[PDB]
């Protein structure tokens, strides 16, 4: 129920949160730092993209392609 | 509106309009101190004109660059369900026409509703009357004493006090 | 601004003591009261369906034939699979 | 809001195949379902009087049927999550499942 | 179109000297919740602007008319005028299909109905 | 049962002050611009004295504007001036006055040339003179 | 015939020789029975119509619409009790027998056999309907709509009785619409315009034109307490039939001059409902339907050619339930709320649950939708008046979709939250609330299922 | 109350069931499957081929 | 319907204030009275709220910016809008 409890993200990761360092020519530079950076580490770092997306693995495809071919088959 | 505060319903609704402009939640925090730098560019001068610049040319460029459909937090001013539920709103008073036999439900309920009244039902004497002697004529936004000096009961009761929750 | 503090926190002992009065379920505030009093489960598909199925074919069989044009029903698209050669095929 | 979504997978794994099976069936039907539906028009009644207008714009709407797909699908199914913590998500819903399977 | 609608103009710093606009106002939901606030009301107020909204608006004109003004003689270029128009369309059609159902037939057999 | 002046007398002006406010304040100080004047166009028995109009428009807006209700639910307690074309009107959009709608309204109508002709697909155009030929042209057989 | 006029003169020394209080239920017991014999020998033909005596033939005519003008009655002190049990019974006595000595007289016009029983019966009203006006009003502007309701009633049908006079020594004897078997017709003349103009508007003050109405919202507005004669009055307006049983004949062939009618009244339809959606006060805005979709029936009847009469006939009973109910509506919600204001009652459909399916019910009879009488008594106007000429379509066409945002409002008025300060408003609608809010919606959908016992004979 | 069934989560991303995903994953083949017999057998256009109508003689 | 309790309150708002690194986490959470942590005049007050629109999300009015002073004040009221504690 504490659940929510801080001294945890604090970025090292995130090469879109890198951009710290590209303001830094400039500066903030972080501050408030780890609020957008809440959710931004975890198992949320893969997000698999384009078609790998829509493939699912392409599991079925080339093992059962032939499962009917064929059984006589002549 | 008093010149001070001016600034920030500006300085509200200026990020505001940006975030629902950034896509990724780092663009948006990126553009944070970026975008902050403008403010304080000059952060101590005049009050008038010198720096009514800082307010006469923010109306441009800012209406200019409006309106990219903001994000609207849906329950507020505006906005996709948002006053939604009305099917209940409470009806606060619904307590009077019965016919009981539906009166036997939530004993419990109806004794405590009665001995609400009581102090509704005689707290006016000093309560009424205070406000003859609290404000001399033509009093400005109309609150009591914020205690009333004793004990407020409610004062505001119960329109204002016991008022309609939401669900 | 400090002036709110002798009020509203009464409300905050006033509004949630009011909503603390809100919430009650002893006793099964529902009295109801008074009074008294899946396999089969069979018969009510049968209440269901097989009541009307008869009502509205006995409004059916008794009337087809009276009403002088009654449901139009087309004709049966003969094929030549009765009287007929084919004869191709080409 | 198409923002505020997040990805694909965070616990949707069965409600994210129907997007892509449908959201992609309404693109020019592949193989799938109505695929003698829009596809036996352009191709069928395409040869006739027609416009000459219609063919330039018609097909064209055809494309944005990708990117109508695409955009509520990338939005809501890809990106980063980005939405307000204590989020209560459960899809294991009798009579939910039941209907889409 | 409809409208600018002027949400900047000139102002800053003359017509300061303008308040107690607000005071107006002021005055009043201060009274008005002075009304509104009372535990023993259990009816409608009074709302004298909307009394003054219909009974100035419905009633109190023909009294305040008069038949001068040719702008008020305005009307026969709204009132009559297309009254005149639709007997002119009207009275050609009725005649026009008239003659041709004489001489010549221009309907078939198979109208009953009519 | 208001008892005397209960509304409009016949104004403009007979003490522009003494209207608002005697009852029915329109205007606080007897100039707010609120002053129970706007008799714009008079003769039209219309709006007379009317503690009342051309306090200005496109609505009222709905929205937080808390000081207890102050638009069009919770009724405060004595402003009103026009209303009832108010429920189906709101303020400013983001752009002004482009009417680019009659313009693509009419961006077809750009096309309607392109209606005159065909779209007839077999063959192609291949620029002709007296090739065109629908049916026929010269002898049957 | 006899077996209607005794008994409900008998009705009228039940009331008074009655005790106290006994004498609201003593009444509208009985009044309800004499409906039995207001079908009893009617409902006969049908075909070569029913005349069973010298002077009456009660209705044959296939214009029924006498058993409504019975129903209304006994509908009456269901309607008026509300603030009418204020003053005393002696008074209250009265207020019972004037109300009768209406319904007398409307079963003795219907009927009639003739002219001149007609119109000295169709002027004998506004004795009873003026004294029920100006008395038990409630604003003190009732006293104009005393004069109003008359100095045009009967400022133009007194020539009347001097063109039916006029010929009833010219061409034989009028005693008789069953004998017009000798009509020649009314060819032209400069006096022959005026004749057929006397024989006519007489009528029309009464169905408004979209001139001189004038009076219509007058008498309405302020108006007894329940609507009690109210709803009479909706239906002595329609009972200005009989131009049904003239310009069917007697002067059958001047259409000449029809043309000032059409487009008079054809061009208001389209309009007094579009000056009727910014009305502040409700029982106004009930007040200007009743002249639309009656003034239809005008352009219904003097087009000749049937498919109107199937038509005009289910209009006149078309809204006079719908009509009637909504005045029984702004009745009630009035009851509790004693402004007639309608910004002022919001947020009702919370605190009124069951009353909801009422407004509902009512307001989705001026949309017609299509299985009810309400269309099946328009879609016969269209069809003979669109043959007429095409372009009817066009307003008439209109007329069906100003009517749609019109009665809508009226409802999605009274769909908000308000609480707002109303302490009042605490009667959940006892049971005559909604008791005399039925008798209409049961009736009134009901003969759509034979709804061949509503139509002319054409 | 109702119950505790499932916690919620302050983004440690929850759990599934694990028979949500695989029961669902059988519906993943039915498209892959189901596609099977696009090229098999059908081409792009199973047609035949106009042969330009040269015998203008 | 879902459970909602004054704890997580004095949590959140005591959360994300630690998370920000413009914050020592040593400092006091319920009552700083933050106008030690108000500099400046603006970049705060509207500034801390900015944030904390971005977990619950009910429109943060406007008015109620001045309530923010204590650190204490502002979980104060959010529990009477959303229908919070007893
Ligand atoms: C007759 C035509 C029926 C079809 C149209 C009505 C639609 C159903 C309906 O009434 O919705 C009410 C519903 C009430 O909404 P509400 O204000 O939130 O409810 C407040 C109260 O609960 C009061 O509203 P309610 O929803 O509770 O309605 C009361 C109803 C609710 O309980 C029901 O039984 C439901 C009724 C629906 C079917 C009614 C009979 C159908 C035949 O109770 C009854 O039915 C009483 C028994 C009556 C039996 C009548 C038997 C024949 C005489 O919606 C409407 O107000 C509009 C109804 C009209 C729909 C459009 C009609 C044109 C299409
Ligand atoms: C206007 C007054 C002008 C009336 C002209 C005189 C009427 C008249 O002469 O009637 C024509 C005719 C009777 O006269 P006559 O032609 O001699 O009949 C032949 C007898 N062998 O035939 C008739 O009997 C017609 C007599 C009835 C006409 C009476 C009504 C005429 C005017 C009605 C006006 C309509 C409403 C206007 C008044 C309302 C406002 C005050």
């Known amino acids: 129920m504490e659940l929510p409890d801080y001294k945890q993200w604090k970025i090292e990761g995130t090469p879109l949160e890198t951009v710290q360092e590209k303001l830094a020519a400039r500066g903030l530079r972080d501050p408030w730092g780890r609020n957008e950076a809440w959710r931004y580490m975890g198992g949320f770092a893969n997000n698999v993209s384009f078609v790998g997306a829509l493939l699912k693995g392409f599991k079925w495809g080339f093992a059962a392609f032939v499962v009917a071919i064929g059984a006589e088959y002549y | 509106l008093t010149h001070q505060q001016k600034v920030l319903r500006l300085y509200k609704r200026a990020l505001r309009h940006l975030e629902s402009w950034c896509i990724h939640r780092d663009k948006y925090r990126y553009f944070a101190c970026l975008l902050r730098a403008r403010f304080d560019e000059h952060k101590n001068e005049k009050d008038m004109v010198k720096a009514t610049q800082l307010l006469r040319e923010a109306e441009e460029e800012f209406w200019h660059g409006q309106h990219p459909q903001p994000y609207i ?95 | 601004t400090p002036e709110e503090k002798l009020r509203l926190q009464q409300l905050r002992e006033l509004r949630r003591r009011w909503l603390k009065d809100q919430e009650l379920s002893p006793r099964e505030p529902v009295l109801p009261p008074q009074r008294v009093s899946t396999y089969r489960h069979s018969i009510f598909a049968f209440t269901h369906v097989l009541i009307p199925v008869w009502i509205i074919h006995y409004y059916l069989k008794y009337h087809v034939t009276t009403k002088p044009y009654t449901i139009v029903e087309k004709k049966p698209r003969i094929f030549p699979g009765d009287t007929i050669l084919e004869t191709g095929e080409v | 809001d198409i923002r505020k979504m997040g990805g694909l997978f965070k616990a949707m794994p069965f409600t994210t195949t129907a997007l892509i099976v449908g959201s992609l069936a309404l693109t020019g039907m592949p193989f799938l379902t109505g695929f003698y539906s829009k596809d036996l028009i352009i191709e069928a009644a395409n040869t006739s009087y027609t416009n000459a207008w219609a063919l330039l714009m018609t097909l064209i709407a055809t494309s944005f049927t990708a990117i109508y797909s695409t955009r509520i699908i990338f939005f809501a199914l890809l990106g980063q999550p980005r939405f307000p913590t204590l989020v209560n998500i459960n899809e294991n819903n009798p009579l939910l499942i039941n209907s889409i399977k | 179109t409809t409208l600018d609608p002027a949400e900047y103009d000139i102002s800053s710093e003359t017509r300061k000297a303008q308040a107690e606009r607000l005071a107006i106002r002021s005055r009043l939901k201060r009274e008005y919740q002075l009304q509104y606030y009372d535990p023993s009301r259990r009816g409608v107020i009074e709302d004298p602007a909307l009394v003054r909204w219909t009974y100035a608006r419905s009633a109190n004109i023909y009294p305040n008319f008069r038949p001068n003004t040719k702008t008020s003689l305005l009307g026969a270029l709204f009132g009559i005028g297309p009254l005149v128009f639709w007997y002119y369309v009207f009275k050609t059609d009725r005649d026009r299909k008239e003659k041709l159902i004489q001489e010549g037939k221009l309907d078939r057999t198979f109208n009953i109905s009519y | 049962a208001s008892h005397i002046t209960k509304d409009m007398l016949p104004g403009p002006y007979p003490k522009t002050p003494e209207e608002r406010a005697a009852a029915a304040k329109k205007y606080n100080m007897r100039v707010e611009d609120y002053e129970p004047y706007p008799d714009d166009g008079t003769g039209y028995g219309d709006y007379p004295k009317l503690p009342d109009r051309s306090q200005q428009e496109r609505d009222p807006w709905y929205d937080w504007d808390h000081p207890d209700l102050r638009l069009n639910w919770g009724e405060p307690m004595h402003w009103d001036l026009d209303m009832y074309i108010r429920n189906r009107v709101d303020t400013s959009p983001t752009p002004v006055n482009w009417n680019l709608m009659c313009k693509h309204l009419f961006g077809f109508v750009a096309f309607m040339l392109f209606m005159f002709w065909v779209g007839e697909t077999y063959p192609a155009y291949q620029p002709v003179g007296p090739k065109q030929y629908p049916y026929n042209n010269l002898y049957l057989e | 015939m006899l077996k209607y006029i005794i008994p409900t003169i008998m009705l009228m020394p039940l009331t008074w020789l009655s005790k106290n209080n006994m004498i609201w239920v003593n009444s509208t017991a009985h009044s309800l029975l004499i409906s039995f014999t207001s079908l009893l020998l009617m409902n006969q033909f049908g075909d070569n119509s029913l005349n069973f005596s010298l002077l009456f033939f009660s209705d044959s005519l296939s214009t029924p619409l006498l058993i409504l003008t019975m129903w209304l009655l006994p509908l009456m002190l269901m309607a008026s009790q509300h603030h009418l049990s204020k003053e005393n019974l002696t008074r209250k006595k009265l207020f019972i027998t004037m109300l009768i000595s209406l319904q007398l007289f409307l079963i003795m016009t219907f009927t009639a056999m003739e002219l001149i029983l007609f119109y000295i019966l169709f002027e004998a009203t506004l004795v009873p309907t003026l004294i029920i006006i100006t008395r038990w009003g409630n604003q003190t502007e009732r006293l104009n709509a005393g004069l109003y309701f008359l100095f045009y009633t009967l400022a133009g049908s007194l020539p009347l009785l001097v063109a039916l006079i006029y010929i009833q020594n010219t061409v034989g004897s009028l005693n008789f619409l069953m004998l017009q078997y000798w009509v020649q017709p009314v060819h032209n003349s400069w006096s022959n315009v005026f004749m057929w103009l006397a024989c ?82 409700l029982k106004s805005l009930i007040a200007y339907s009743s002249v639309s979709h009656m003034a239809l029936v005008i352009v219904a009847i003097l087009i000749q050619t049937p498919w109107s009469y199937m038509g005009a006939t289910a209009l006149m009973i078309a809204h006079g339930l719908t009509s009637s109910m909504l005045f029984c509506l702004a009745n009630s919600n009035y009851e509790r709320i004693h402004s007639r204001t309608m910004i002022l009652a919001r947020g009702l459909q919370t605190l009124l649950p069951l009353m909801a399916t009422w407004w509902l019910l009512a307001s989705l009879t001026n949309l017609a939708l299509p299985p009810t009488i309400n269309l099946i008594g328009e879609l016969f106007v269209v069809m003979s008046t669109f043959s007429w000429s ?46 005399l809010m039925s008798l209409h919606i049961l009736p009134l959908l009901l003969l759509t299922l034979n709804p061949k016992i509503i139509l002319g004979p054409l | 109350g109702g119950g505790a069934h499932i916690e919620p989560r302050y983004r440690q991303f929850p759990q599934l069931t694990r028979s949500q995903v695989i029961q669902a994953e059988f519906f993943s083949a039915t498209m892959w499957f189901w596609i099977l017999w696009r090229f098999w057998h059908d081409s792009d256009a199973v047609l035949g081929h106009f042969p330009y109508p040269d015998p203008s003689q | ?42 970049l705060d007050q509207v500034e801390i709220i900015m944030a904390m629109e971005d977990e619950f999300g009910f429109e943060i009015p406007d008015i109620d910016a001045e309530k923010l002073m204590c650190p204490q004040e502002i979980v104060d009221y959010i529990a009477d809008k959303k229908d919070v504690y007893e």
């Open chain 2, 73 to 167: 937090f849906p329950e507020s001013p505006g906005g996709t369900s948002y006053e939604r539920y009305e099917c209940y709103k409470v009806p606060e008073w619904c307590l009077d026409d019965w016919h009981p036999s539906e009166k036997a439900m939530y004993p419990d309920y109806f004794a405590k509703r009665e001995q609400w009244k009581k102090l509704r039902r005689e707290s006016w004497e000093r309560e009424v009357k205070q406000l003859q002697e609290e404000t001399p004529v033509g009093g400005p936004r109309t609150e009591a004493l914020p205690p009333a000096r004793k004990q407020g009961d409610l004062p505001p009761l119960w329109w204002h006090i016991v008022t309609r929750p939401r669900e």
């Open chain 7, 200 to 281: 006519m508007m007489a009528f029309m003050v009464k169905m408004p034109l979209y001139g001189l109405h004038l009076w219509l919202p007058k008498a309405h507005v302020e108006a007894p307490i329940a609507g009690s004669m109210v709803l009479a009055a909706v239906l002595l307006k329609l009972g200005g039939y009989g131009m049904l049983r003239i310009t069917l004949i007697l002067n059958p062939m001047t259409d000449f001059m029809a043309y000032p009618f059409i487009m008079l009244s054809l061009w208001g339809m389209i309009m007094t409902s579009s000056i009727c959606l910014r009305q502040t006060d």
């Open chain 7, 390 to 435: 095409n372009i009817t379509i066009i307003l008439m066409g209109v007329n069906m979709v100003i009517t749609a945002l019109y009665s809508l409002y009226m409802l999605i008025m009274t769909q908000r939250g308000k609480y707002t300060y109303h302490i009042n408003n605490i009667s959940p609608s006892f049971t005559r609330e909604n008791a």
């Open chain 9, 1 to 42: 319907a879902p459970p909602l309790t004054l704890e997580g309150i004095k949590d959140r708002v005591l959360y994300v204030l630690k998370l920000y690194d413009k914050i020592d986490p040593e400092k006091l959470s319920v009552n700083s009275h933050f106008m030690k942590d108000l500099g400046l005049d603006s």
